[PDB]
Symmetry: D2
Subunit: 353 residues, 4 copies
């Protein structure tokens, strides 16, 4: 009873290998309309459809030195249907520059009862038609975010198991409709836990994820994994080097992600624009063996410098676009181990709770 034919299988592998092609990464430009409110209000701008339109249009129409740095662009619903100033739909803008377009399909998180503050994610209702439509309209991959937090009795048995189960459902549905699932099991940096405790939980959680994807029969070569880096909690007093968290990210994934996964696209997680680039470099330089692409899927850590330089004023466009382009060139050096560098609001920490 094949889940997929040969030709669907090779077309998902094809898309997946494009997105993470050597030296390419992803721009996560998929902020909910309510989440992009607090980004905009941090630079004084009002949250109107055309302020979001112009901001998203800022990122997509940047110089062609970004073209080989950005293999894919995850958008939010409203944005997939928005047009540029030259009248081209935003997905054609991205494809014209050699970027594959994706689409966030999760409908936010929801509380699991019986737990200390834990969530599952929702969005599976009608997800099959939506993917069918988003595929007609230009999308080729998808993002579903699950959220886990390290606390004293968290992440619990039930939490890890329901979040792993709905990631796999999501990925099964995505792949029947020709769309590559980005799987996002996120562990947040909230808390005071040390490096090794993030390591032990990352492992425990990816183990449960790849078992869930096996149970649901999903083609691992046409998926991507979007995991946290492995980092001390944001209240940790101990301090850890870039090498030590490289080792600990890379061994956790060695220990748990089968080589069949096409690529691994890290979240930035709240790290500064620059410590994100620096860590991604420490990781691709690790001497250990790493049979999958280790690259980036960054929201805040490609966009903070560009937002502060945009300011709300169309006059600042070319100023802000080159804060975005310097970040994409920087990260495309780090996803190949070639990043050697001093930056100011590229050093601001981007952690929220």
């Amino acid at each position: 009873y094949p889940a997929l034919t040969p030709e669907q299988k090779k077309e998902l592998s094809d898309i997946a290998h494009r997105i993470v092609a050597p030296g390419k990464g992803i721009l996560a430009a998929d902020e909910s309309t309510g989440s992009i409110a607090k980004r905009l209000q941090s630079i004084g701008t009002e949250n109107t459809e055309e302020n979001r339109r112009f901001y998203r249009q800022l990122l997509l129409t940047a110089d062609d030195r970004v073209n080989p740095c950005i293999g894919g662009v995850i958008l939010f619903h409203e944005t997939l249907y928005q047009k540029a100033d030259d009248g081209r739909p935003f997905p054609q803008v991205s494809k014209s520059k050699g970027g594959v377009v994706g689409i966030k399909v999760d409908k936010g998180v929801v509380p699991l009862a019986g737990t200390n503050g834990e969530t599952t994610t929702q969005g599976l209702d009608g997800l099959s038609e939506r993917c069918a439509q988003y595929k007609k309209d230009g999308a080729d991959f998808a993002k579903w975010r699950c959220v886990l937090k390290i606390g004293e009795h968290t992440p619990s048995a039930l939490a890890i198991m329901e979040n792993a189960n709905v990631l796999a459902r999501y990925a099964s549905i995505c792949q029947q409709n020709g769309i590559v699932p980005i799987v996002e099991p996120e562990i947040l940096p909230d808390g005071d836990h040390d490096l090794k405790r993030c390591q032990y939980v990352t492992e425990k959680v990816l183990a449960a994820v790849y078992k869930a994807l096996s149970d649901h029969h999903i083609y691992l070569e046409g998926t991507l994994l979007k995991p946290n880096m492995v980092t001390p909690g944001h209240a940790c007093t101990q301090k850890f080097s870039h090498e030590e968290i490289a080792m600990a990210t890379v061994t956790a994934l060695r220990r748990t992600v089968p080589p069949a996964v096409t690529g691994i696209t890290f979240l930035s997680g709240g790290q500064s624009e620059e410590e994100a680039s620096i860590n991604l470099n420490a990781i691709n330089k690790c001497p250990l063996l790493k049979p999958w692409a280790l690259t980036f899927s960054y929201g805040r850590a490609l966009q903070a410098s560009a937002l502060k330089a945009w300011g709300g004023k169309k006059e600042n466009l070319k100023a802000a676009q080159e804060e975005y382009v310097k970040r994409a060139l920087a990260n495309s050096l780090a996803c190949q181990g070639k990043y050697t560098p001093a930056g100011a609001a590229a050093s601001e920490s981007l952690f929220v709770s």
Copy 2:
């Protein structure tokens, strides 16, 4: 960290006892719009809002001999917001007759990739806000239907796990918002399987349901279960008496349903209006100890005569009403052990696939 307070728990427990208080049953007026169309071209009536309002009004305004036999009625979402000719809203029409109002909250089945024709159910997205409102609007319990088929390589381990889980998510969200969940893991009659096969599969399903409802921290005294009876398959050559169906069914449950469950309300299946009331009676006369209510949540098997009397014509209203009443009274004595059979609509098999 507890899902529910002691007040929240007495409410749920009291609601679930009112429904299956001795001699009472559940009338499943649940049919979606498209599934009730198939019932209405049965008798040459077009499928209009008004015909659907009229036929429902005929079951909920049947005379007061039926008040002691109907603890609850499950309405599709549309019916909940329609009014009798009196102007009285249908929730308040049945409140008046000593019955609790349920709501169907699932949203149909969807296929599971990699599987031989199997399904999970969808409907969790926005469930909690939906239930909060149904509760304000008169509903005190919910129905959600998962469907398994016996067959070559079915019901799969993946389909059992995914269905028990999604019934557990549904149930936790119902109790948070005050609503007793009904838990319907229906195993279809379709196929040539024998009684004992269907006993195996039922036993292994309900075990997996109650491990899932335990993992999700579900309050069992405020639940009900609506399973199938254990029956030979509808195409099975060999023949089985009604006391063989009573044993096979009482024992499937005594090996799986914890005593704390407040009530078991059986589903009719493809069973004739009369076979369903004889197998229900044979079960309550089964002398093996049974520490839950054994009662009925029949839809087709309480309405077949009703429907082939009415025929779509206003004049047959009291003739239809009476045939639904005669069934409700037969089933309310089946629900006590006290039914001795002594028409043709009522011996017709009501099977479909």
Copy 3:
């Protein structure tokens, strides 16, 4: 692929219903040779084969007013093969008085690595032949003890799951060889935890047990469950009435043990001889509905008064035997709700760690 024929099934049900027949309980006289060392040294006696022989012979040859109080006697290996003074093998002594004989088959506990102090149990190697032999030699049921402790991260996911898995293996093997498994998932009273925390863990652990027994295909009507009472930890400062722990024991089991289980034979757990009898009475008087026998399988709480009165001196035999008989009559009133009573070393607490 039946696990058992009809005739094996009815012979296990027959044995199980004997052991817990109305007003009957079990004597747990199965102390390891190393465990019975610390019992003997507490009364000054040397641990020699004939001091154990004479002590076990004290309990088995007691007055015939014990005959209707004691449905079964769990022995240790060496003891199954030991003879009385009249030359009769100990199992014939027990059968002559109407007691079924059992046999502890677990080979002690072992540490699970990676956990904070947790154990699994071993004993499955060659268990199938041993049961075959013990059945030829008089044994008809068996005891396997698993041990869980409540602490901060205990009992963990892995611990509950391996102990539930090897209980079920044990029970599968026992039943192929015609022997009724007593399943002993013990939660110890060590720690300072309140009543509700023992309740929540008992539930979590029996849920996992009955799922494990379902997965392994074992006939629940020819088994017994030997669970702790549900009690505050032994360092709890809060205080709780006999009724409150009756409620909490009886609801935990209602919520999780299917009625098919023939009987529930509690461990005493360290409680005093008398608080054990008192609590077992509070439980059989609980107004809730309880579809399985609630009776006793006591080691320390039928034998402390008899050991202190035996003292090591054969002269004290008839003195010590009537400390054992008064305890068996007392508990056979409590397993029927008829125990109304002041005792001294029958009030000593028997808790070890």
Copy 4:
């Protein structure tokens, strides 16, 4: 609470690299006494302690051309405590030739009730004290064999769960006592199944093994895996090239074995001495990225010529020895990609059931 210290972890990791260091393999001299009898009436020799000591001595004293091709040898327990004619103990005979000494620690398969002919394995009882001593006596790794069969309703979900678990218990106990565990989830060739079927089942087994080894907190850099190659079933009508077996086998592993596993040492199956070395070579020439050692743990398929030369007669010693050497050298170049085939004992299928 960690299973292992950093010293305990480097030791294990170093041991596992010595065994599968490039070009080396494992000789399975493991056969129990009863299973080697079947091999020795093959060539008309009676099964004596001395013949068994003599035949083993012939493989472990083969000349020094084989030192670079044999990183480890797995002895049955008896062989570990026998001496060559020199007086030198067999563990120290192979220490001398640059090979690590393994020990078989399992204790045979046992049936699983309720199942269609399926097995778990036993041998955990007393395992830890056994391993502590094997370690003193020269063993640095262990073998434990679980067996699954493809067929009607096989390998069952119960048999997969129970076998992965018991291999995880075995592995945790080996690493506590210093011994690298080898993890052999063998899927038998028996049956008419096609290559792709056997790929499905292998994929779903090794996924369940590595969720179990993760749950049990198993150190993966100090493990090896000894699985079957993915092969059509021995009775399959249709025919498959060796590059179809190489793809089907490299991809089954890339979808399941985490990169951290130090080595994969294949089992021969019923494969001819020569087919086994061609499929091993086709696999190391498979250009798909493979981040583990792909090498051999052959028993029958490194000794068939050896055995039909020797014939039971002292005079053929150096003729036998040479045929085992010619195989070890073929297999050590298969283990690098560098074997081009260019007798009859060596094309005979070595299948059994």
